[PDB]
Design a protein around this nucleic acid. Structure first.
Ligand SMILES: [K+]
Ligand SMILES: [K+]
Ligand SMILES: [K+]
Ligand SMILES: [K+]
Ligand SMILES: [K+]
Ligand SMILES: [K+]
Ligand SMILES: [K+]
Ligand SMILES: [K+]
Ligand SMILES: [K+]
Ligand SMILES: [K+]
Ligand SMILES: [K+]
Ligand SMILES: [K+]
Ligand SMILES: [K+]
Ligand SMILES: [K+]
Ligand SMILES: [K+]
Ligand SMILES: [K+]
Ligand SMILES: [K+]
Ligand SMILES: [K+]
Ligand SMILES: [K+]
Ligand SMILES: [K+]
Ligand SMILES: [K+]
Ligand SMILES: [K+]
Ligand SMILES: [K+]
Ligand SMILES: [K+]
Ligand SMILES: [K+]
Ligand SMILES: [K+]
Ligand SMILES: [K+]
Ligand SMILES: [Mg+2]
Ligand SMILES: [Mg+2]
Ligand SMILES: [Mg+2]
Ligand SMILES: [Mg+2]
Ligand SMILES: [Mg+2]
Ligand SMILES: [Mg+2]
Ligand SMILES: [Mg+2]
Ligand SMILES: [Mg+2]
Ligand SMILES: [Mg+2]
Ligand SMILES: [Mg+2]
Ligand SMILES: [Mg+2]
Ligand SMILES: [Mg+2]
Ligand SMILES: [Mg+2]
Ligand SMILES: [Mg+2]
Ligand SMILES: [Mg+2]
Ligand SMILES: [Zn+2]
Lengths: 53, 68, 245, 114, 91
RNA sequence: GCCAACUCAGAACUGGUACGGACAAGGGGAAUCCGACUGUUUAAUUAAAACAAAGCAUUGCGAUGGUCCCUGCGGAUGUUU
RNA sequence: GGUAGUAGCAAAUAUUCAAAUGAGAACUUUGAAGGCCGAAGAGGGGAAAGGUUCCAUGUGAACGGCACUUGCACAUGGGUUAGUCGAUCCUAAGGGUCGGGGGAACCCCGACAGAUAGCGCGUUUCGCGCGUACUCCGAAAGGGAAUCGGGUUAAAAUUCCUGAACCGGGACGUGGCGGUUGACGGCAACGUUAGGAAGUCCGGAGACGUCGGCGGGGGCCUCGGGAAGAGUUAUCUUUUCUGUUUAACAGCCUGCCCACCCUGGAAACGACUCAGUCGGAGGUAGGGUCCAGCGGCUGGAAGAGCACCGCACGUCGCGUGGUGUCCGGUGCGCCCCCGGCGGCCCUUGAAAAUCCGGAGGACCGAGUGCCGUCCACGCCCGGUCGUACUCAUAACCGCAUCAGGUCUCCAAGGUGAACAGCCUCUGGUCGAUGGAACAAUGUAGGCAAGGGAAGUCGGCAAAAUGGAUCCGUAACUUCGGGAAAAGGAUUGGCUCUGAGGGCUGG
RNA sequence: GGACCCGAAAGAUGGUGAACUAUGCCUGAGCGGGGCGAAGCCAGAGGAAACUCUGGUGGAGGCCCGCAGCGAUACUGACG
């Protein structure tokens, strides 16, 4: 099979985890499309309710 | 296919008329005895090779036996 | 020179009623000895929605008078009736909402629904949601009861005609504005192909007396003869008057 | 990324054309037809499911295909009415018969008095 | 926060159909979607299933009532009239 | 102690101020006329202010009936009121 | 005939080198290179429609708008295998009818004017009891009895081969089960492979809209470790790439979200979801029952498949042997299925065949054999027709190998909000007659100093604006909007800092 | 009278088409990613009270940008 490597993708993932390529010039979707506040609220509610329990 | 968990039940199954053939598979960790009947294939797993050999000796004379 | 829409209605085949999802006709029990002389008890098992009908319907289970089986009926629901309620049909049935009684046993001033016209016809008057008939008076000499119908007309019927006590459930439906064409589309989709309606003055002359003209206008009186032939009888048919009150 | 095709000449995604993807011992994915989801028996009085009976297609309940214990419940009206419904029916029957006896006795006593 | 000054439920219609019609339909919108007291089990669990049909989620009783309200105004009057006539007949 | 994800917000340094680097992707404002709006229309010159629409008003009719189809017999509205 | 060897052959990025064959090669085949389709494909299948176009061999002439050694052309042969996939069965809108009513009649209405088909029990084949005028056609997407891997052809396969199952029907034999004539256990939900029964009656499944959130399962995507092979290696790279599989069916286990049962009796109210909601009509809590599964283990089943490493014939052994197929993580991810809530309706979103269960108990048997038995095993059978192939920038229609039209299933990686645009992997493909030149005029696509609509009927066309983050936003208004009004600022790379979690252990 | 030959727009009679298109009915199938943020619900602040205000949650609409699908405004572009 023809070569199609994932090394560049893995390196880019590492850089993004380090915090690279995440500025205002690298964002196309809205904050909501990137990560819904509903998802964030659900996570927070689950965490806090589990702690209280 | 069905599994028999007892050597006595395996012998009872192999003694019946419709038992066509017996196949003995020799795996690394056990021995499998398979009886071909009219409706189902009955498999008995023996962990110990000594009881496996004893069963092989105890197989009825009139039943064909083959080794794998 | 073309058949008009009102004329084409009668042939049907696209103007037939849409009845695929309906639950069968709603009517009283067939009049029999038990209802004629005593009373018969049934139980309300379900209240259901009948598509194309504003009023809800009630499924009622009765014990067959002379057979070992269940007698199943579908009544036009009266307001206030509930599942598990006991319904009593007959001449001796008590005067309670939901019971079916002969008009001879219903005192004057009573509110009833699904009133029979002919004894045993199983109900033809005052069946729509929120509608009712009112018992006015009795005439024992000829055995006839007078009733006021929803339209306000007074009608004389045989005193043996049956009627359910109370008014039809679902009243006040027409008060709500629909606000949009989609609601009317949904409403008439389960009734018949009668919507939307094209105005006669918007058509060409060939297909309507109101059609034609360089301006939109009827061009002649919209009141027509009672004996005007089909295709010519459009507008306000046999109007005794027009305009505001 | 193996892409699949229908195994039959049904080319439309209807309710009766539901499939699952299964990996065969030959190392390749394949479709396998799956039966439509069916609701099990329901109690007419309470409207809730009847316990002790699996939810299968009507033909899967055939006696030759399903064991008796799997399609029977050992109680009066078992498999048809729920336990609470049966209890309610028994209590109603007993109490109504008792009240009928009471009414008959009261009528007899009134007739004797008059 | 007070999301709407006066629109309330009819805010779903935006700026369509006219203020008078929106206000007129507000009453039905509120009533048909409100919960109602159940006389059979003493709970506020009666909800409209379809026009004229009101079912209780707790005890399961289903009643025939008004198109957009559990009890129409005329229903009480009819009940009172029927009760008066029945009492007159029975006495 | 062992694992786990990409979201967010800040601070330095740095490039010929380049950086949503291709791609992707509203021009805006002040008024008049018409139609309320969404919808529909002359397949192959007209998509519109035309048609429909919710809303408003008028007319007939209680079944031995109103409207309509049919040579006739009988039918649609009507599983209706 | 002139027109005239003239008009034309120009959309869908693109071909090049070497060799083989052949009289003849830009166009056939092999290899190499350079490109495209870019998964809502130029890939892999179906429905209709076509009808042999499917596969092999060969080829004078015609045809394939240049050419051909070639082929969806021509000629000679071959090819479509079913109890399990469909039709077949059911009924939908409706269609066709008896009788009756009309009609000169062809015919019209259609169960509406009427002694219905028949159905069960025991039998001297006769008797008894039920019997509301169509037991007809109508879906290769509605409903619905049953099959799975592995292998195999030039062309067929869930149909052929092997192995292993299942469904329907028939008849008996053996064993087992009940007789307290018609089982046992659990307080209960209910459990156990069996465990009476006729007319009659009742319930359920089949069986159902749409939208939104959340949760579970299968497949895919993705990260790490072990091992096998391959790619790169002037330099670095424990790194890059590929694969590391488990079908129907049987048993056991488990028991999501719900539902249900037992103990007990609650305000200082508690429990609880993302959202709701629940509780003296019995909550929390403790303990159980049941339901789904495309969940787990075992048999099937490693003997199979795949990868790797060897020996051998070396013209025809479909030959012969070994090693591995292992252990974890992650998620508003993508496709499908399921569960449970909530929103919407003047809209409430089929029927029947068929199957299961239940109410009743007429009737029925014996003492070492009788009567029953939906239990286990054993035995036999399973018709007819379709099945090749295309499904389209040449296999259907459009007079054609026409840039048009024609229903639907599957759907990788990167960037990015994104089945947007752009690039890439599997798969496919370079098929649009070729060569030389770069005049005018055109078609399509750009740029242009200074001015900026003076052009024009008219800003037609083009240009300008555009994503995201922050600040800010007027008149008017039906108070819902206007609104992205308007108007301003920022955006790369690199190196960091802070915040936001899970499991285990008293 | 066919009436030297050829020629109408029409009229009548009897049959055939809803494989295109129009409408009703039955049964199936299909429709990214974002924006605005109505009911309902939670918490907090102000106030003497009445009551008002704020921050969250949720996800309504014949609502908006927009892919597929469906359609067809302008160039009065190409072709003609
Ligand atoms: K005419
Ligand atoms: K219409
Ligand atoms: K109109
Ligand atoms: K006119
Ligand atoms: K006018
Ligand atoms: K059971
Ligand atoms: K719209
Ligand atoms: K419009
Ligand atoms: K338009
Ligand atoms: K109009
Ligand atoms: K009539
Ligand atoms: K040749
Ligand atoms: K006749
Ligand atoms: K008939
Ligand atoms: K079918
Ligand atoms: K096989
Ligand atoms: K269906
Ligand atoms: K729903
Ligand atoms: K299967
Ligand atoms: K029984
Ligand atoms: K085939
Ligand atoms: K086809
Ligand atoms: K100008
Ligand atoms: K001018
Ligand atoms: K002449
Ligand atoms: K058609
Ligand atoms: K349709
Ligand atoms: Mg997103
Ligand atoms: Mg006008
Ligand atoms: Mg007549
Ligand atoms: Mg797709
Ligand atoms: Mg060929
Ligand atoms: Mg006849
Ligand atoms: Mg039949
Ligand atoms: Mg919605
Ligand atoms: Mg991924
Ligand atoms: Mg192996
Ligand atoms: Mg019984
Ligand atoms: Mg033709
Ligand atoms: Mg991304
Ligand atoms: Mg058609
Ligand atoms: Mg737009
Ligand atoms: Zn209640």
């Amino acid at each position: 099979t023809k070569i199609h490597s994932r090394s560049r993708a893995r390196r880019m993932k590492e850089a993004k985890r380090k915090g690279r390529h995440s500025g205002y010039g690298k964002r196309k979707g809205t904050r909501e499309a990137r990560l819904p506040t509903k998802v964030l609220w659900m996570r927070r509610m689950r965490v806090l309710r589990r702690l209280l329990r | 296919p069905k599994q028999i968990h007892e050597i006595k039940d395996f012998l009872l199954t192999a003694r019946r008329k419709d038992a066509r053939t017996v196949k003995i598979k020799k795996n690394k960790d056990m021995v499998k005895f398979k009886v071909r009947c009219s409706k189902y294939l009955y498999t008995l797993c023996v962990s110990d090779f000594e009881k496996a050999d004893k069963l092989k000796q105890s197989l009825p004379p009139g039943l064909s036996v083959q080794d794998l | 020179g073309r058949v008009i829409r009102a004329q084409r209605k009668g042939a049907g085949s696209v103007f037939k009623s849409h009845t695929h999802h309906r639950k069968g006709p709603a009517k009283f029990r067939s009049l029999d000895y038990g209802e004629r002389n005593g009373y018969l008890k049934g139980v309300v098992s379900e209240i259901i929605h009948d598509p194309g009908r504003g009023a809800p319907l009630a499924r009622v289970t009765f014990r067959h008078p002379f057979r070992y089986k269940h007698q199943k009926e579908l009544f036009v629901a009266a307001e206030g009736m509930y599942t598990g309620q006991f319904i009593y049909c007959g001449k001796k049935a008590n005067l309670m909402v939901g019971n079916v009684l002969a008009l001879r046993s219903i005192p004057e001033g009573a509110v009833v629904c699904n009133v029979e016209h002919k004894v045993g016809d199983r109900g033809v008057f005052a069946r729509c949601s929120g509608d009712y008939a009112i018992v006015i008076s009795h005439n024992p000499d000829n055995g006839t009861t007078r009733i006021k119908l929803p339209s306000g007309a007074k009608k004389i019927v045989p005193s043996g005609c049956r009627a359910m006590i109370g008014q039809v459930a679902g009243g006040g439906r027409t008060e709500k504005p629909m606000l949009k064409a989609g609601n009317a589309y949904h409403k008439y989709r389960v009734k018949r192909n009668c919507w939307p309606k094209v105005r006669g003055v918007a058509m060409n002359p060939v297909e309507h007396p109101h059609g034609g003209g360089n301006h939109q206008h009827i061009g002649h009186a919209s009141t027509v003869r009672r004996d005007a032939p089909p295709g010519q009888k459009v507008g306000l048919i046999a109007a005794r008057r027009t305009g505001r009150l | 990324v193996q892409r699949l095709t229908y195994r039959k000449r049904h080319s439309y995604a209807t309710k009766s054309n539901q499939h699952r993807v299964v990996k065969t011992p030959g190392g390749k994915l394949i479709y396998q037809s799956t039966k439509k989801r069916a609701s099990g028996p329901k109690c007419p009085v309470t409207g809730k499911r009847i316990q002790g009976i699996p939810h299968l297609r009507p033909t899967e309940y055939k006696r030759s295909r399903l064991s008796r214990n799997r399609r029977t419940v050992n109680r009066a009206y078992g498999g048809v009415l729920s336990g609470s419904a049966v209890r309610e029916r028994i209590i109603r029957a007993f109490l109504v018969e008792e009240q009928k006896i009471v009414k008959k006795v009261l009528k007899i006593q009134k007739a004797k008095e008059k | 926060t007070k999301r709407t000054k006066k629109a309330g439920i009819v805010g779903k219609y935006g700026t369509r159909y006219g203020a008078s019609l929106r206000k007129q339909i507000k009453k039905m919108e509120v009533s048909q979607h409100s919960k109602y007291f159940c006389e059979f089990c003493g709970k506020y669990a009666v909800k409209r299933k379809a026009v004229g049909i009101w079912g209780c989620k707790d005890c399961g009783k289903v009643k025939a009532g008004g198109a957009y309200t559990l009890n129409t105004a005329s229903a009480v009057t009819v009940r009172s009239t029927i009760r008066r006539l029945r009492e007159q007949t029975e006495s």
